[PDB]
């Protein structure tokens, strides 16, 4: 329903955030290995 559209967005929105955090994990791990 209309609620399926609403939900579908969030799904995609979260997926993005995850990929962003992932890069952030990469960076912090590099930051750890330097310290």
């Amino acid at each position: 329903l209309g609620s399926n559209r609403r939900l579908q967005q969030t799904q995609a929105q979260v997926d993005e955030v995850v990929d962003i955090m992932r890069v952030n994990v990469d960076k912090v791990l590099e930051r750890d290995q330097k310290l």
Binding site: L1, S3, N4, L7, Q8, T10, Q11, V14, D15, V17, V18, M21, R22, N24, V25, V28, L29, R31, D32, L35
Partner: protein, 59 residues
């Protein structure tokens, strides 16, 4: 009515899994960073001694 709620429920679970994993990353980040922060505290303390020793020597 049932078939729609069924399929909707499935997507809810999908969303739960993502948020869960995302959350776990956020937590791991905080702990991991907090740990690193304490190593930095050391380096700072360490360097500040070296700096003071050098300054004292010139004087």
């Amino acid at each position: 009515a049932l078939s729609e709620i069924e399929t909707r429920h499935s997507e809810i679970i999908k969303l739960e899994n993502s948020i869960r994993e995302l959350h776990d990353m956020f937590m791991d980040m905080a702990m991991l960073v907090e740990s690193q922060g304490e190593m930095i505290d050391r380096i700072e303390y360490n360097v500040e001694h070296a700096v003071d020793y050098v300054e004292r020597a010139v004087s």
